[PDB]
Amino acid sequence: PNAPACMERQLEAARYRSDGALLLGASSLSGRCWAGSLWLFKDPCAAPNEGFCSAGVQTEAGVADLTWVGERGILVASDSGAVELWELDENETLIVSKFCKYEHDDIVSTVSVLSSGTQAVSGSKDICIKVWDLAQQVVLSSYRAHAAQVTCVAASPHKDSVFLSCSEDNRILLWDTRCPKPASQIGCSAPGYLPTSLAWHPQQSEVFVFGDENGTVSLVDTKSTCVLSSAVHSQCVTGLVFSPHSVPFLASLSEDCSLAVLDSSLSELFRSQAHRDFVRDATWSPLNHSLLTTVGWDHQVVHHVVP
């Protein structure tokens, strides 16, 4: 279908669109050529099989993070130092470079689209965070707040000027581009383990969660100052995605190659040993809220049914 024959071994990203069609990011982290690729699968259960898919394209380089820009566009965190925007044609057969801007100085590691959907914020190993204009194809502002690699940036669900970030400098920063000093440190008292993953609560604008490198997921209420925390994983918490459910569930992924699903009080409901390598993403079906799809570096696309 106009794409590569072989897709790269190491699956980085997995994101459902509002209608139910699966977005896939893949890089090759070993072998002769170290690049990546983008893939659309209108059949969720056909993935990751290449020739029986809706669309596909090769990127010059790997793919550390991506996310949807609405319904047609795909925002990409490259190893090249590029934020790139790829957008589908009207037929949804091709995937076309819309822009590719080489603005970070090291690998771009995390990206998250803001609530307007016309702006986005990327984070990198060069220690910077950048706010982008997706119409104009430019960096509006560039912020060096951290002292180490920026591990994760997450846009506020609804407020276009607010987002979280976290870094190997042990800081969790709440940003608010309206304030003249936009960043603000959210000390969890001690120098407790480094923050690895972030997720805003989708129904409470005051709440978020974060995972650490020691496998602990934590519940934070912005202002109060670390309500609760559970030792969910035995290794680094790679990602956190809240479900679209009314009182939502929290999927937690890790380098112990295990998915977990958690409730309001971070108690364990589901657990999946299905992957044999690192679990890199999670995305809940907007057509079936019991369904949850994970990718890994074992090249599996598992589909879990959650009670």
């Binding site: 090291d106 912020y143 002292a147 035995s234």
Partner: protein, 625 residues
């Protein structure tokens, strides 16, 4: 021309990327050898049993290209000093794997970061790699002038950037290196790759890196300003640092993506090239020095040893030396021979240690321009040199010059002298034993006689050079005290070093020596005010001499006779380096010692801490009488 390389942390195809890089003008590439994001598990099932190749094949380049064009890069997820045990353990295995792969490929160097204070386990692992056989690779420790925490934008509202000065705090990156290199026991395979930021620190912080083994300077694309035509350039302060770095012959590494997208990427490199071309060119002193920088040598002992033909030739090719000796003799003859006696009075002029005759010729050339008459004696103990004198004498000088083939202390003279002339001086003035010689030669000087030179003074200054300390440290030899190399002076063109205090005089001698009971033994105490934090590794020696009246010679930098490249400085090392904090005084003690066969130096530091006395009883170093 500059030796310069490209840093990337993303290489999809080695083949193409290397070609692209060579095209742009770079000499080498810094790249990962496993994919930077490819985190690997070594203990936990299931991830540990991850199949597939762990990286790309060594077949992708020629062994030659691997040896010459590639600098390895530690993967940035490898954190041997994490607070999480599981990560420390993986990171150990990972570091080892990546380093053992670096050595497998035969890479000429391999980068590791110093980016926090505690690098103890990182040092432990690297060190262990170094002692797993005697393979020769280098390790470049990537360390920034300014820690990233101290250059962050002032944008966290509840955590502002400290606006007060912190003298010691601002040097903290130096101490990260110091701790790290101290732990690895001053390995010669561990050098610095110094990363330069957008805003430079205060001068003292940059001055800390004087003396350190900087093999590389990393310049991010982001630090480059833009001139009116859109090309990338650098601030004048950044240019100063680059000019300093070019004297250290460092390899320049360019890191980051292109920010000047209006122009292509060879421009950044072409700027450095332009800056290399446009330095102040190599002066008349620094043309000869080139080659001999921080190269340790034995000080000559032309008394005990007979100097070689090419050795005489070196110290002869120095016209400043002899025009000053000519001038000092010119002036002396006039002061002793009134114009009315310019034919009756013939001055008895003895060159003591005549070599192959350049001071004889300078003595002739001087007696011509003064229009006085001179009877010359040329004493030389080196019978090989005396061959050259007696051939000169028969072919040219006639019996104006009596050549005497003798030690000047053995010689019974036919007549007393009006002027004794000599060049028995070494880089520390008295280190060839000019005092002892001219004392034994004093009995055949007229009651009113002159010595040229009449006076010389040695000078000392404390220095920091972790480079030279290691250089000395490397002079261990079988069948002698394993610390002997530290208890002896070297002559050396001191280059990568920091002078910690103004030179101060140490030992002075006078000829003729009036003083009834003489004694050339000596004891001197010097106090050196030091205004920086630093590490003391030794004392540089220099000297000044008065030939006659205002006519002088000097290698003391502050009064150097311009263009006198003969004599390099001397270096007295010490065994253990001594921390010196800004405001402290370094007190050093020097003795000149002797018995009837040997003369030698001994020395110690007494402040801020005591060293051992170095070279006691001349056990490791003596100068032969």
């Amino acid at each position: 021309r500059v030796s310069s390389g490209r840093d990337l942390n993303c290489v999809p195809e080695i083949a193409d990327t290397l070609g692209a890089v060579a095209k742009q003008g770079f000499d080498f590439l810094c790249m990962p050898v496993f994919h930077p994001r490819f985190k690997r598990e070594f203990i936990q099932e299931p991830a540990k049993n991850r199949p597939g190749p762990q990286t790309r094949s060594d077949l992708l380049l020629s062994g030659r290209d691997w040896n010459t064009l590639i600098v390895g890069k530690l993967s940035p997820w490898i954190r041997p000093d994490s607070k999480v045990e599981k990560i420390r353990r993986n990171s150990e295995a990972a570091m080892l794997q990546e380093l053992n792969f670096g050595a497998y490929l035969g890479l000429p160097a391999f980068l590791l970061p110093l980016n926090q204070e505690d690098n103890t386990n990182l040092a432990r692992v690297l060190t262990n790699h170094i002692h797993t056989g005697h393979h020769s690779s280098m390790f470049w420790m990537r360390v920034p002038l300014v820690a990233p925490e101290d250059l962050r934008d002032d944008i966290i509202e509840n955590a502002p950037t400290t606006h007060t000065e912190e003298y010691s705090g601002e040097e903290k990156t130096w101490m990260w290196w110091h701790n790290f290199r101290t732990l690895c026991d001053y390995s010669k395979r561990i050098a610095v790759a110094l990363e330069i930021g957008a805003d430079l620190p205060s001068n003292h912080v940059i001055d800390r890196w004087l003396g350190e083994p900087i093999k590389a300077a990393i310049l991010p694309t982001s630090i480059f300003l833009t001139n009116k035509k859109g090309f990338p350039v650098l601030s004048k302060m950044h240019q100063r640092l680059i000019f300093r770095l070019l004297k250290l012959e460092v390899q320049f590494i360019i890191t980051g993506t292109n920010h000047h997208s209006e122009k292509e990427f060879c421009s950044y490199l072409q700027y450095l090239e332009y800056l290399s071309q446009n330095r102040p060119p190599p002066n008349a002193y620094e043309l000869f020095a080139k080659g001999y920088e921080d190269y340790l040598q034995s000080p000559l002992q032309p008394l005990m040893d007979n100097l070689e033909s090419q050795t005489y030739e070196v110290f002869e090719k120095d016209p400043i030396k002899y025009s000053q000796y000519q001038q000092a003799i010119y002036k002396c003859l006039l002061d002793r021979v009134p114009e009315e006696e310019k034919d009756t009075n013939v001055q008895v002029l003895m060159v003591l240690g005549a070599g192959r005759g350049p001071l004889v010729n300078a003595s002739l050339r001087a007696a011509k321009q003064a229009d006085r008459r001179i009877k010359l004696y040329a004493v030389e103990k080196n019978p090989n040199a005396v061959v050259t004198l007696e051939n000169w004498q028969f072919e040219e000088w006639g019996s104006q010059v009596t050549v005497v083939s003798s030690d000047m202390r053995e010689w019974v003279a036919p007549e007393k002298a009006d002027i004794i002339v000599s060049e028995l001086l070494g880089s520390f003035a008295d280190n060839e034993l000019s005092p002892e010689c001219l004392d034994g030669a004093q009995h055949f000087l007229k009651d009113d006689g002159v010595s040229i030179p009449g006076e010389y003074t040695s000078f000392l200054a404390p220095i920091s050079s972790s480079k030279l300390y290691n250089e000395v440290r490397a002079c261990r030899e079988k069948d002698r005290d394993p610390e002997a190399q530290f208890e002896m002076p070297y002559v050396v063109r001191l280059h990568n070093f920091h002078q910690l205090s103004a030179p101060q005089p140490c030992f002075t001698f006078s000829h003729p020596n009036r003083d009834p009971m003489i004694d050339n033994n000596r004891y001197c105490t010097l106090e050196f005010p030091v205004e920086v934090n630093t590490v003391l590794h030794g004392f540089a020696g220099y000297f000044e001499t008065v030939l006659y009246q205002d006519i002088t010679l000097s290698i003391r930098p502050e009064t150097h006779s311009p263009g006198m490249f003969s004599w390099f400085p001397i270096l007295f090392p010490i065994k253990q380096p001594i921390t010196v904090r800004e405001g402290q005084t370094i007190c050093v003690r020097f003795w000149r010692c002797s018995n009837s066969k040997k003369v030698w130096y001994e020395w110690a530091v007494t402040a801020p801490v005591c060293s051992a006395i170095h070279n006691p009883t001349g056990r490791s170093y003596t100068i032969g009488l």
